[PDB]
GROMACS .gro file of N, CA, C and O in nm:
model
  484
    1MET      N    1  -0.528  -2.390   4.129
    1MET     CA    2  -0.382  -2.417   4.135
    1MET      C    3  -0.322  -2.416   3.995
    1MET      O    4  -0.321  -2.518   3.926
    2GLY      N    5  -0.270  -2.301   3.954
    2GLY     CA    6  -0.212  -2.290   3.822
    2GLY      C    7  -0.211  -2.146   3.773
    2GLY      O    8  -0.232  -2.054   3.851
    3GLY      N    9  -0.188  -2.128   3.644
    3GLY     CA   10  -0.184  -1.995   3.588
    3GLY      C   11  -0.276  -1.980   3.468
    3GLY      O   12  -0.267  -2.056   3.371
    4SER      N   13  -0.367  -1.884   3.476
    4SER     CA   14  -0.462  -1.860   3.369
    4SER      C   15  -0.448  -1.717   3.316
    4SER      O   16  -0.450  -1.622   3.394
    5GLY      N   17  -0.435  -1.704   3.185
    5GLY     CA   18  -0.417  -1.573   3.126
    5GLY      C   19  -0.457  -1.571   2.980
    5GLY      O   20  -0.444  -1.673   2.911
    6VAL      N   21  -0.507  -1.458   2.933
    6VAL     CA   22  -0.549  -1.445   2.795
    6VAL      C   23  -0.430  -1.413   2.705
    6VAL      O   24  -0.361  -1.313   2.724
    7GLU      N   25  -0.404  -1.500   2.609
    7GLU     CA   26  -0.297  -1.479   2.513
    7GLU      C   27  -0.351  -1.411   2.388
    7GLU      O   28  -0.455  -1.450   2.336
    8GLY      N   29  -0.281  -1.309   2.341
    8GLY     CA   30  -0.323  -1.238   2.222
    8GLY      C   31  -0.208  -1.166   2.156
    8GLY      O   32  -0.150  -1.074   2.214
    9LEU      N   33  -0.175  -1.206   2.034
    9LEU     CA   34  -0.064  -1.145   1.961
    9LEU      C   35  -0.114  -1.038   1.866
    9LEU      O   36  -0.214  -1.058   1.796
   10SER      N   37  -0.046  -0.925   1.864
   10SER     CA   38  -0.081  -0.815   1.776
   10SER      C   39   0.001  -0.821   1.647
   10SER      O   40   0.100  -0.894   1.639
   11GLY      N   41  -0.041  -0.745   1.548
   11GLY     CA   42   0.031  -0.737   1.423
   11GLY      C   43  -0.028  -0.630   1.334
   11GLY      O   44  -0.148  -0.603   1.342
   12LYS      N   45   0.055  -0.568   1.252
   12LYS     CA   46   0.008  -0.463   1.163
   12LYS      C   47  -0.086  -0.520   1.058
   12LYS      O   48  -0.062  -0.628   1.004
   13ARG      N   49  -0.193  -0.448   1.029
   13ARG     CA   50  -0.290  -0.492   0.931
   13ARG      C   51  -0.282  -0.407   0.805
   13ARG      O   52  -0.251  -0.288   0.810
   14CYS      N   53  -0.306  -0.470   0.691
   14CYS     CA   54  -0.313  -0.399   0.564
   14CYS      C   55  -0.422  -0.458   0.476
   14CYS      O   56  -0.439  -0.580   0.471
   15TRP      N   57  -0.497  -0.372   0.411
   15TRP     CA   58  -0.600  -0.416   0.318
   15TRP      C   59  -0.556  -0.384   0.177
   15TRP      O   60  -0.496  -0.279   0.153
   16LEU      N   61  -0.583  -0.473   0.083
   16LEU     CA   62  -0.542  -0.451  -0.053
   16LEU      C   63  -0.656  -0.476  -0.151
   16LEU      O   64  -0.728  -0.576  -0.141
   17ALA      N   65  -0.674  -0.382  -0.242
   17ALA     CA   66  -0.770  -0.394  -0.349
   17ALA      C   67  -0.695  -0.391  -0.482
   17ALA      O   68  -0.719  -0.306  -0.568
   18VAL      N   69  -0.603  -0.484  -0.496
   18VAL     CA   70  -0.521  -0.496  -0.616
   18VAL      C   71  -0.580  -0.603  -0.707
   18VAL      O   72  -0.598  -0.717  -0.666
   19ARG      N   73  -0.613  -0.564  -0.829
   19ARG     CA   74  -0.672  -0.657  -0.924
   19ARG      C   75  -0.563  -0.731  -0.999
   19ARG      O   76  -0.588  -0.831  -1.067
   20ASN      N   77  -0.441  -0.681  -0.987
   20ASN     CA   78  -0.324  -0.747  -1.043
   20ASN      C   79  -0.282  -0.861  -0.953
   20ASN      O   80  -0.212  -0.841  -0.854
   21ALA      N   81  -0.323  -0.982  -0.988
   21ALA     CA   82  -0.306  -1.099  -0.902
   21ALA      C   83  -0.159  -1.133  -0.880
   21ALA      O   84  -0.117  -1.158  -0.767
   22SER      N   85  -0.082  -1.135  -0.987
   22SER     CA   86   0.060  -1.166  -0.977
   22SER      C   87   0.134  -1.058  -0.898
   22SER      O   88   0.217  -1.088  -0.812
   23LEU      N   89   0.100  -0.933  -0.926
   23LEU     CA   90   0.159  -0.820  -0.857
   23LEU      C   91   0.123  -0.822  -0.708
   23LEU      O   92   0.211  -0.810  -0.622
   24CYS      N   93  -0.005  -0.838  -0.679
   24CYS     CA   94  -0.054  -0.832  -0.542
   24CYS      C   95   0.006  -0.943  -0.458
   24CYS      O   96   0.039  -0.923  -0.341
   25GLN      N   97   0.024  -1.060  -0.519
   25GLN     CA   98   0.084  -1.173  -0.450
   25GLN      C   99   0.230  -1.144  -0.416
   25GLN      O  100   0.280  -1.183  -0.311
   26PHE      N  101   0.298  -1.073  -0.505
   26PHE     CA  102   0.438  -1.037  -0.484
   26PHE      C  103   0.453  -0.941  -0.366
   26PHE      O  104   0.529  -0.967  -0.273
   27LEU      N  105   0.378  -0.831  -0.369
   27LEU     CA  106   0.389  -0.729  -0.267
   27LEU      C  107   0.339  -0.779  -0.132
   27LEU      O  108   0.400  -0.751  -0.028
   28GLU      N  109   0.229  -0.854  -0.132
   28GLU     CA  110   0.170  -0.900  -0.007
   28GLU      C  111   0.263  -0.997   0.065
   28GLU      O  112   0.274  -0.993   0.187
   29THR      N  113   0.331  -1.083  -0.010
   29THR     CA  114   0.423  -1.179   0.049
   29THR      C  115   0.548  -1.109   0.103
   29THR      O  116   0.598  -1.142   0.211
   30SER      N  117   0.597  -1.010   0.028
   30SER     CA  118   0.714  -0.934   0.070
   30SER      C  119   0.687  -0.860   0.201
   30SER      O  120   0.776  -0.845   0.285
   31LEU      N  121   0.563  -0.815   0.217
   31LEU     CA  122   0.522  -0.742   0.336
   31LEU      C  123   0.491  -0.838   0.451
   31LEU      O  124   0.520  -0.809   0.567
   32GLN      N  125   0.434  -0.953   0.418
   32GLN     CA  126   0.396  -1.052   0.518
   32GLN      C  127   0.519  -1.111   0.587
   32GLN      O  128   0.509  -1.165   0.696
   33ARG      N  129   0.634  -1.097   0.523
   33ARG     CA  130   0.760  -1.143   0.580
   33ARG      C  131   0.793  -1.066   0.708
   33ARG      O  132   0.880  -1.106   0.785
   34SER      N  133   0.723  -0.955   0.729
   34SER     CA  134   0.742  -0.873   0.847
   34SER      C  135   0.645  -0.914   0.958
   34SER      O  136   0.658  -0.872   1.072
   35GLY      N  137   0.548  -0.999   0.924
   35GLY     CA  138   0.448  -1.038   1.020
   35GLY      C  139   0.320  -0.959   1.005
   35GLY      O  140   0.226  -0.973   1.084
   36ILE      N  141   0.316  -0.874   0.904
   36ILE     CA  142   0.198  -0.794   0.875
   36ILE      C  143   0.093  -0.881   0.805
   36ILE      O  144   0.127  -0.964   0.720
   37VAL      N  145  -0.033  -0.863   0.842
   37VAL     CA  146  -0.141  -0.945   0.786
   37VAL      C  147  -0.223  -0.865   0.684
   37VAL      O  148  -0.279  -0.760   0.716
   38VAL      N  149  -0.229  -0.916   0.562
   38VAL     CA  150  -0.303  -0.851   0.455
   38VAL      C  151  -0.439  -0.917   0.435
   38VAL      O  152  -0.456  -1.036   0.464
   39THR      N  153  -0.535  -0.840   0.388
   39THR     CA  154  -0.668  -0.890   0.358
   39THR      C  155  -0.730  -0.812   0.242
   39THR      O  156  -0.713  -0.690   0.233
   40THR      N  157  -0.797  -0.884   0.153
   40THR     CA  158  -0.862  -0.823   0.038
   40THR      C  159  -0.972  -0.727   0.081
   40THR      O  160  -1.060  -0.763   0.160
   41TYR      N  161  -0.968  -0.605   0.029
   41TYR     CA  162  -1.066  -0.504   0.064
   41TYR      C  163  -1.179  -0.501  -0.038
   41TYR      O  164  -1.162  -0.454  -0.150
   42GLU      N  165  -1.294  -0.554   0.001
   42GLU     CA  166  -1.412  -0.553  -0.083
   42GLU      C  167  -1.522  -0.471  -0.016
   42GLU      O  168  -1.506  -0.351   0.006
   43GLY      N  169  -1.633  -0.535   0.019
   43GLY     CA  170  -1.739  -0.467   0.090
   43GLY      C  171  -1.715  -0.469   0.239
   43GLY      O  172  -1.795  -0.523   0.316
   44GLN      N  173  -1.604  -0.410   0.280
   44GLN     CA  174  -1.565  -0.410   0.420
   44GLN      C  175  -1.553  -0.267   0.471
   44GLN      O  176  -1.554  -0.172   0.393
   45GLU      N  177  -1.542  -0.252   0.602
   45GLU     CA  178  -1.534  -0.120   0.663
   45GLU      C  179  -1.389  -0.075   0.676
   45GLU      O  180  -1.306  -0.146   0.734
   46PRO      N  181  -1.357   0.043   0.622
   46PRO     CA  182  -1.223   0.102   0.631
   46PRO      C  183  -1.185   0.141   0.774
   46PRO      O  184  -1.265   0.202   0.845
   47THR      N  185  -1.065   0.104   0.815
   47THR     CA  186  -1.018   0.133   0.949
   47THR      C  187  -0.922   0.252   0.951
   47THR      O  188  -0.832   0.263   0.867
   48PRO      N  189  -0.942   0.345   1.047
   48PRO     CA  190  -0.861   0.466   1.061
   48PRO      C  191  -0.712   0.438   1.085
   48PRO      O  192  -0.627   0.522   1.056
   49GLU      N  193  -0.680   0.320   1.137
   49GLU     CA  194  -0.542   0.285   1.164
   49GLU      C  195  -0.489   0.186   1.060
   49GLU      O  196  -0.381   0.129   1.077
   50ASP      N  197  -0.564   0.167   0.952
   50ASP     CA  198  -0.525   0.073   0.848
   50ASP      C  199  -0.504   0.145   0.715
   50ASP      O  200  -0.554   0.256   0.695
   51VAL      N  201  -0.432   0.081   0.625
   51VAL     CA  202  -0.401   0.139   0.495
   51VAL      C  203  -0.463   0.058   0.382
   51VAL      O  204  -0.476  -0.065   0.393
   52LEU      N  205  -0.502   0.126   0.275
   52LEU     CA  206  -0.562   0.061   0.160
   52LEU      C  207  -0.467   0.065   0.040
   52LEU      O  208  -0.446   0.170  -0.020
   53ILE      N  209  -0.411  -0.049   0.006
   53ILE     CA  210  -0.325  -0.060  -0.110
   53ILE      C  211  -0.408  -0.094  -0.233
   53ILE      O  212  -0.458  -0.205  -0.245
   54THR      N  213  -0.423   0.001  -0.323
   54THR     CA  214  -0.513  -0.014  -0.437
   54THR      C  215  -0.435  -0.017  -0.568
   54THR      O  216  -0.328   0.043  -0.579
   55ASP      N  217  -0.489  -0.088  -0.667
   55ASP     CA  218  -0.425  -0.095  -0.798
   55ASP      C  219  -0.518  -0.042  -0.907
   55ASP      O  220  -0.638  -0.067  -0.905
   56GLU      N  221  -0.459   0.032  -1.001
   56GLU     CA  222  -0.530   0.093  -1.111
   56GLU      C  223  -0.644   0.183  -1.064
   56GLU      O  224  -0.623   0.271  -0.980
   57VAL      N  225  -0.763   0.163  -1.118
   57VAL     CA  226  -0.876   0.249  -1.088
   57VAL      C  227  -0.988   0.171  -1.021
   57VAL      O  228  -1.052   0.086  -1.084
   58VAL      N  229  -1.010   0.199  -0.894
   58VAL     CA  230  -1.115   0.133  -0.818
   58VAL      C  231  -1.221   0.234  -0.775
   58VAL      O  232  -1.188   0.342  -0.727
   59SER      N  233  -1.347   0.199  -0.795
   59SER     CA  234  -1.457   0.290  -0.766
   59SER      C  235  -1.477   0.309  -0.615
   59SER      O  236  -1.522   0.415  -0.571
   60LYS      N  237  -1.445   0.208  -0.536
   60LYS     CA  238  -1.458   0.218  -0.391
   60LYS      C  239  -1.337   0.288  -0.331
   60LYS      O  240  -1.225   0.272  -0.379
   61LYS      N  241  -1.360   0.366  -0.227
   61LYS     CA  242  -1.253   0.441  -0.162
   61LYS      C  243  -1.228   0.388  -0.021
   61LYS      O  244  -1.279   0.282   0.017
   62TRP      N  245  -1.151   0.463   0.055
   62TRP     CA  246  -1.108   0.421   0.188
   62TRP      C  247  -1.100   0.541   0.281
   62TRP      O  248  -1.054   0.648   0.242
   63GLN      N  249  -1.148   0.523   0.403
   63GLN     CA  250  -1.137   0.625   0.505
   63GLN      C  251  -1.061   0.568   0.625
   63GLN      O  252  -1.118   0.498   0.708
   64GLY      N  253  -0.932   0.597   0.632
   64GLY     CA  254  -0.850   0.541   0.737
   64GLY      C  255  -0.717   0.611   0.749
   64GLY      O  256  -0.710   0.734   0.745
   65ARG      N  257  -0.611   0.532   0.764
   65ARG     CA  258  -0.477   0.586   0.781
   65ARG      C  259  -0.427   0.653   0.653
   65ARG      O  260  -0.398   0.772   0.652
   66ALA      N  261  -0.419   0.575   0.546
   66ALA     CA  262  -0.371   0.627   0.418
   66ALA      C  263  -0.407   0.531   0.305
   66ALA      O  264  -0.438   0.414   0.329
   67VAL      N  265  -0.402   0.582   0.183
   67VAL     CA  266  -0.427   0.500   0.066
   67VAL      C  267  -0.307   0.503  -0.027
   67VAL      O  268  -0.247   0.608  -0.049
   68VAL      N  269  -0.270   0.387  -0.079
   68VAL     CA  270  -0.157   0.377  -0.170
   68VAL      C  271  -0.203   0.314  -0.301
   68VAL      O  272  -0.214   0.192  -0.312
   69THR      N  273  -0.233   0.398  -0.399
   69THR     CA  274  -0.289   0.351  -0.524
   69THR      C  275  -0.187   0.360  -0.638
   69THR      O  276  -0.133   0.467  -0.668
   70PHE      N  277  -0.162   0.246  -0.701
   70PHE     CA  278  -0.068   0.238  -0.811
   70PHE      C  279  -0.143   0.220  -0.943
   70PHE      O  280  -0.185   0.109  -0.976
   71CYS      N  281  -0.160   0.328  -1.016
   71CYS     CA  282  -0.228   0.323  -1.145
   71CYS      C  283  -0.129   0.350  -1.258
   71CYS      O  284  -0.018   0.399  -1.234
   72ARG      N  285  -0.170   0.318  -1.380
   72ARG     CA  286  -0.085   0.343  -1.496
   72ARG      C  287  -0.077   0.493  -1.526
   72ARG      O  288   0.029   0.544  -1.562
   73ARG      N  289  -0.189   0.562  -1.511
   73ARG     CA  290  -0.195   0.705  -1.539
   73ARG      C  291  -0.291   0.777  -1.443
   73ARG      O  292  -0.280   0.898  -1.425
   74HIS      N  293  -0.384   0.702  -1.384
   74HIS     CA  294  -0.484   0.755  -1.289
   74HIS      C  295  -0.593   0.833  -1.363
   74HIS      O  296  -0.564   0.912  -1.452
   75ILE      N  297  -0.718   0.807  -1.327
   75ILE     CA  298  -0.830   0.880  -1.385
   75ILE      C  299  -0.914   0.945  -1.275
   75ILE      O  300  -0.882   1.055  -1.229
   76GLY      N  301  -1.018   0.876  -1.230
   76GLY     CA  302  -1.104   0.929  -1.125
   76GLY      C  303  -1.054   0.893  -0.986
   76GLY      O  304  -1.132   0.886  -0.891
   77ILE      N  305  -0.924   0.868  -0.976
   77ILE     CA  306  -0.863   0.832  -0.849
   77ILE      C  307  -0.786   0.951  -0.792
   77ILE      O  308  -0.715   1.019  -0.867
   78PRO      N  309  -0.803   0.980  -0.662
   78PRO     CA  310  -0.729   1.085  -0.592
   78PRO      C  311  -0.580   1.080  -0.623
   78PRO      O  312  -0.509   0.988  -0.582
   79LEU      N  313  -0.532   1.180  -0.697
   79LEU     CA  314  -0.395   1.181  -0.745
   79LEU      C  315  -0.300   1.240  -0.641
   79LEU      O  316  -0.226   1.334  -0.670
   80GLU      N  317  -0.302   1.182  -0.521
   80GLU     CA  318  -0.219   1.229  -0.412
   80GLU      C  319  -0.252   1.374  -0.379
   80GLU      O  320  -0.368   1.406  -0.349
   81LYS      N  321  -0.152   1.462  -0.390
   81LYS     CA  322  -0.166   1.604  -0.358
   81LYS      C  323  -0.245   1.624  -0.229
   81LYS      O  324  -0.335   1.708  -0.222
   82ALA      N  325  -0.210   1.544  -0.129
   82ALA     CA  326  -0.275   1.546   0.001
   82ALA      C  327  -0.200   1.454   0.096
   82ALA      O  328  -0.160   1.344   0.057
   83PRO      N  329  -0.177   1.498   0.221
   83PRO     CA  330  -0.110   1.417   0.323
   83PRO      C  331  -0.195   1.300   0.370
   83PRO      O  332  -0.239   1.296   0.486
   84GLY      N  333  -0.219   1.205   0.281
   84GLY     CA  334  -0.300   1.089   0.314
   84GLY      C  335  -0.323   1.001   0.193
   84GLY      O  336  -0.339   0.879   0.206
   85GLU      N  337  -0.323   1.062   0.076
   85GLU     CA  338  -0.340   0.989  -0.048
   85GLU      C  339  -0.205   0.977  -0.118
   85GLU      O  340  -0.132   1.075  -0.127
   86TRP      N  341  -0.172   0.858  -0.163
   86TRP     CA  342  -0.046   0.834  -0.231
   86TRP      C  343  -0.071   0.776  -0.370
   86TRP      O  344  -0.111   0.661  -0.384
   87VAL      N  345  -0.048   0.857  -0.472
   87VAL     CA  346  -0.059   0.810  -0.609
   87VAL      C  347   0.079   0.774  -0.663
   87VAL      O  348   0.178   0.841  -0.632
   88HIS      N  349   0.088   0.667  -0.739
   88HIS     CA  350   0.214   0.624  -0.796
   88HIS      C  351   0.190   0.539  -0.919
   88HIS      O  352   0.088   0.472  -0.929
   89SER      N  353   0.283   0.542  -1.012
   89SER     CA  354   0.274   0.460  -1.131
   89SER      C  355   0.335   0.322  -1.107
   89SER      O  356   0.434   0.309  -1.035
   90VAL      N  357   0.273   0.220  -1.165
   90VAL     CA  358   0.324   0.083  -1.155
   90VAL      C  359   0.446   0.064  -1.246
   90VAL      O  360   0.442  -0.017  -1.339
   91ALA      N  361   0.552   0.138  -1.219
   91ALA     CA  362   0.674   0.130  -1.298
   91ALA      C  363   0.746  -0.001  -1.273
   91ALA      O  364   0.796  -0.065  -1.366
   92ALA      N  365   0.751  -0.041  -1.148
   92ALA     CA  366   0.814  -0.166  -1.108
   92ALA      C  367   0.751  -0.217  -0.980
   92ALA      O  368   0.721  -0.138  -0.891
   93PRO      N  369   0.728  -0.348  -0.969
   93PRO     CA  370   0.668  -0.410  -0.851
   93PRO      C  371   0.733  -0.366  -0.719
   93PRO      O  372   0.665  -0.350  -0.619
   94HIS      N  373   0.865  -0.343  -0.721
   94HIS     CA  374   0.938  -0.307  -0.599
   94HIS      C  375   0.901  -0.167  -0.547
   94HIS      O  376   0.939  -0.131  -0.436
   95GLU      N  377   0.828  -0.090  -0.627
   95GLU     CA  378   0.791   0.045  -0.589
   95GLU      C  379   0.687   0.043  -0.477
   95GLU      O  380   0.685   0.130  -0.390
   96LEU      N  381   0.601  -0.058  -0.479
   96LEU     CA  382   0.491  -0.067  -0.384
   96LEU      C  383   0.538  -0.100  -0.242
   96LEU      O  384   0.507  -0.025  -0.149
   97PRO      N  385   0.612  -0.211  -0.221
   97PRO     CA  386   0.656  -0.252  -0.087
   97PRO      C  387   0.745  -0.146  -0.022
   97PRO      O  388   0.745  -0.131   0.101
   98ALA      N  389   0.819  -0.072  -0.104
   98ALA     CA  390   0.905   0.034  -0.055
   98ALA      C  391   0.822   0.151  -0.002
   98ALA      O  392   0.850   0.205   0.104
   99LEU      N  393   0.718   0.186  -0.077
   99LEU     CA  394   0.628   0.294  -0.037
   99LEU      C  395   0.554   0.256   0.091
   99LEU      O  396   0.538   0.338   0.181
  100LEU      N  397   0.511   0.130   0.097
  100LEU     CA  398   0.440   0.078   0.214
  100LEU      C  399   0.526   0.091   0.339
  100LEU      O  400   0.480   0.137   0.443
  101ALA      N  401   0.653   0.052   0.327
  101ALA     CA  402   0.745   0.058   0.439
  101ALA      C  403   0.766   0.201   0.486
  101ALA      O  404   0.775   0.228   0.606
  102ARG      N  405   0.774   0.294   0.391
  102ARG     CA  406   0.792   0.435   0.423
  102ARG      C  407   0.670   0.491   0.496
  102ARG      O  408   0.685   0.567   0.592
  103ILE      N  409   0.552   0.454   0.451
  103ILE     CA  410   0.428   0.505   0.508
  103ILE      C  411   0.404   0.448   0.648
  103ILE      O  412   0.365   0.521   0.739
  104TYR      N  413   0.430   0.319   0.665
  104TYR     CA  414   0.405   0.252   0.793
  104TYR      C  415   0.524   0.268   0.888
  104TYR      O  416   0.526   0.207   0.995
  105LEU      N  417   0.621   0.349   0.848
  105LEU     CA  418   0.740   0.377   0.929
  105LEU      C  419   0.813   0.248   0.966
  105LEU      O  420   0.838   0.220   1.084
  106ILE      N  421   0.844   0.169   0.865
  106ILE     CA  422   0.920   0.046   0.884
  106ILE      C  423   1.069   0.076   0.870
  106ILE      O  424   1.106   0.178   0.813
  107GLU      N  425   1.153  -0.011   0.925
  107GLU     CA  426   1.298   0.008   0.921
  107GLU      C  427   1.349   0.020   0.777
  107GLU      O  428   1.437   0.100   0.748
  108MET      N  429   1.292  -0.059   0.688
  108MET     CA  430   1.335  -0.062   0.548
  108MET      C  431   1.255   0.037   0.463
  108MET      O  432   1.209   0.003   0.354
  109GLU      N  433   1.239   0.159   0.513
  109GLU     CA  434   1.162   0.261   0.443
  109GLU      C  435   1.236   0.310   0.319
  109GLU      O  436   1.176   0.327   0.213
  110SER      N  437   1.367   0.334   0.333
  110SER     CA  438   1.454   0.370   0.221
  110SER      C  439   1.415   0.505   0.158
  110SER      O  440   1.337   0.582   0.214
  111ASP      N  441   1.472   0.533   0.040
  111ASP     CA  442   1.452   0.661  -0.027
  111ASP      C  443   1.457   0.642  -0.179
  111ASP      O  444   1.513   0.543  -0.227
  112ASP      N  445   1.399   0.735  -0.252
  112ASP     CA  446   1.396   0.729  -0.398
  112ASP      C  447   1.524   0.790  -0.456
  112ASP      O  448   1.564   0.900  -0.417
  113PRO      N  449   1.591   0.719  -0.548
  113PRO     CA  450   1.716   0.766  -0.609
  113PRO      C  451   1.694   0.879  -0.709
  113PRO      O  452   1.788   0.952  -0.742
  114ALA      N  453   1.569   0.896  -0.754
  114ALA     CA  454   1.534   0.996  -0.855
  114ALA      C  455   1.622   0.980  -0.978
  114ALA      O  456   1.701   1.068  -1.012
  115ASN      N  457   1.608   0.866  -1.045
  115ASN     CA  458   1.693   0.833  -1.158
  115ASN      C  459   1.648   0.903  -1.286
  115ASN      O  460   1.548   0.864  -1.348
  116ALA      N  461   1.722   1.006  -1.324
  116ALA     CA  462   1.694   1.079  -1.447
  116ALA      C  463   1.825   1.117  -1.516
  116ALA      O  464   1.930   1.124  -1.452
  117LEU      N  465   1.818   1.141  -1.646
  117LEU     CA  466   1.935   1.182  -1.722
  117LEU      C  467   1.905   1.307  -1.803
  117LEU      O  468   1.816   1.305  -1.889
  118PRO      N  469   1.977   1.417  -1.777
  118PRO     CA  470   1.956   1.545  -1.845
  118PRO      C  471   1.996   1.540  -1.993
  118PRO      O  472   2.114   1.546  -2.028
  119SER      N  473   1.896   1.528  -2.079
  119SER     CA  474   1.919   1.523  -2.222
  119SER      C  475   1.897   1.661  -2.284
  119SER      O  476   1.800   1.682  -2.357
  120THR      N  477   1.987   1.754  -2.254
  120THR     CA  478   1.978   1.889  -2.307
  120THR      C  479   2.030   1.896  -2.451
  120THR      O  480   2.027   2.002  -2.514
  121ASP      N  481   2.078   1.783  -2.501
  121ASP     CA  482   2.128   1.773  -2.637
  121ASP      C  483   2.102   1.633  -2.690
  121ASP      O  484   2.127   1.536  -2.615
   0.00000   0.00000   0.00000
């Protein structure tokens, strides 16, 4: 006499291998405001439906949805040039959460203003 049912809430997952503690805390919290759950990617198994947010140069890679690596210049890291790898410079902390939203098809995906000034003289 009653009602029995299995309760289970879903949510987008993200793994991060950011060694920049202050930076990673900023981006992860900004993203978690959406209900997305982040987890540090160490000796774990990469998920095909999950993304790897990486900082600088990390020897371990990822096999899944996509990788978003923010390095100063990039060395032995896949420099994008492929529909799955995203290379970007850590110009500003806000660059990461914006890219994440675009990749995960979030409402706040936005667009790049391409801010440049033609100094032909």
